[PDB]
């Protein structure tokens, strides 16, 4: 019993974790096999920000302008290449410690742990989600770009994430390891503005059966609704739509507690409508949507 | 910018992470050098009867895809400590600590001898821990990370009938007053960890919430009064003197900040939020909230 925000293991990610600097700027590679990867700021100045031209910056740098430093060992660059805004540094070392790895592209509403980094070291791990605007709601300071975010489903790692920059509004924006920003951010320091913001439905149903399982029921009640009236009220309260992949995604936990989807459905319009009244779901006073399905279920079962 | 409840990196821990099974009973131990830390109700009660009658090759280690042989075995309070042939080559600078309630810790929850997750908690005023364990993960550890040192502080033993938890420090001396049998045991009434929710406070103030603020200033002593009405721990001299660099750095004294606390608790949020949660947050030490606004790192 209980349920917690709960991150995966961080150990794997960690040893992957190296500081990378170029001239005044250091922030965070991923070192996997013999290629480091990181965002492609790192070659830029806070003046070249505005409007850099990459390919130009890049064609400049020679491989002993990048200083990598695993942990008290200084890597030796041996080539380097950008693939969308990341740079892939080849260094002359294999990393040892490189686990079975993925690049996965996760999509909003998706959740993932995230390794925090400065200067190279692992400072601490959080759960995090992609949010429907593209953006995540992580903790970082200045020198945790590079950091990343992963999924450890079996002994295989997922790289989801790599983080490259603060939004005015304290939110984050960052890319797939492929260097394909999640939204619609560039990396760039022109004006850049997080649309609003939606709930997750989906995963609020997801923690509303986690609920259910761990014995909170107060909030349940007699009546079912249809997708599209369910989807008429969410859109009021800034909920996503609720798409029928999302009733199907949620049909085994539908069946261990035995709450039909569009069942649990009218249990949340009735949330959305009337609060929580002085109680509680799950130690939470508010509708928790960084949670999936599928972490509901990992966590539960 | 952000606030999130953060873990230590669990690498060092993952690296100390074994499966101990005992006849039909398989959980977790810590292997640290020769020995393989783990509850003593694997050999499930009188335990020094039961445990006479266990021999070394009863216990089957296995760390990873490897099968440790057990060649001793001492009971430490409620730890069972099974003397090994190998000692963990990956085992990290460490130290077996006690912690105090109202102190928080990262859990590497694992499952036959396997980290599944990490999650950060606090060592609730009641003893207990509100954590997420299921059947197996008896044996998963709670830790904090000073510099490149291990302390180990928890070990996971029972779940209680409220789905709480309850365990013991590596030395095996419980949290609380419970015990490692099946018996009547129930979690007595939990308060809030007062100190917690002040460095929460700031840690609002520094991302840049300030509307529970408020121009007044209280005396300890009142404060104190407020909060044992609403089932807050007492706030001490040591907590406001731990609170110090926090009120330096957002310019709120303590007794300022304890006033906005005493105002919260009598009129509550009002539909607002601190830090994305409409409840007062208690597990995040004065430390956490420095280690998390400065970037401490590991
Ligand atoms: C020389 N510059 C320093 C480094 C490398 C090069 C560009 N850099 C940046 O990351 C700067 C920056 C950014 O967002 N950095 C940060 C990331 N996460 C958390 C932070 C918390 C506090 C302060 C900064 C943070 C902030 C200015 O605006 C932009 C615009 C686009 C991009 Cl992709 C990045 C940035
Ligand atoms: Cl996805």
């Given at each position: 019993s209980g349920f917690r925000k709960m991150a995966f293991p961080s150990g794997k990610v960690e040893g992957c974790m190296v500081?990378?600097?170029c001239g005044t700027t250091t922030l965070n590679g991923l070192w996997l096999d013999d290629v480091v990867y990181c965002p492609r700021h790192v070659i830029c100045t806070s003046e070249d920000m505005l409007n850099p031209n990459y390919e130009d910056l890049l064609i400049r740098k020679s491989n002993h302008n990048f200083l990598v430093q695993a942990g008290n060992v200084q890597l030796r660059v041996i080539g380097?290449?950008?693939?969308?805004?990341?740079?892939?540094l080849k260094v002359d070392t294999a990393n040892p410690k490189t686990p079975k790895y993925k690049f996965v592209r996760i999509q909003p509403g998706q959740t993932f742990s995230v390794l925090a980094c400065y200067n190279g070291s692992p400072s601490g791990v959080y759960?995090?989600?992609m949010r429907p605007?593209?953006?995540i709601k992580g903790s970082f300071l200045?020198?945790?770009?590079?950091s990343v975010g992963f999924n450890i489903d079996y002994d295989c790692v997922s790289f989801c994430y790599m983080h490259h920059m603060e939004?005015?509004?304290?939110v984050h924006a960052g890319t797939d390891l492929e260097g394909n920003f999640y939204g619609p951010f560039v990396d760039?320091?022109?004006a850049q503005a997080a649309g609003t913001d939606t709930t997750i439905t989906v995963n609020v149903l997801a923690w509303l059966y986690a609920a259910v399982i761990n014995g909170d029921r107060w909030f349940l009640n007699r009546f079912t609704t249809t997708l599209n009236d369910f989807n008429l009220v969410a859109?009021?309260?800034?909920?996503?739509?609720?798409?029928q992949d999302h009733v199907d995604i949620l049909g085994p936990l539908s069946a261990q507690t035995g709450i039909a989807v569009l069942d649990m459905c009218a249990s949340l319009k009735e949330l959305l409508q009337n609060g929580m009244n002085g109680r509680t779901i799950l130690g939470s006073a508010l509708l928790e949507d960084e949670f999936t399905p599928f972490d509901v279920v990992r966590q539960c079962s």
């Open positions: 500081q990378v600097t380097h290449s950008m693939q969308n805004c990341v740079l892939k759960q995090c989600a605007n593209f953006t200045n020198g945790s770009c590079g939004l005015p509004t304290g760039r320091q022109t859109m009021k309260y800034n909920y996503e739509p609720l798409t």
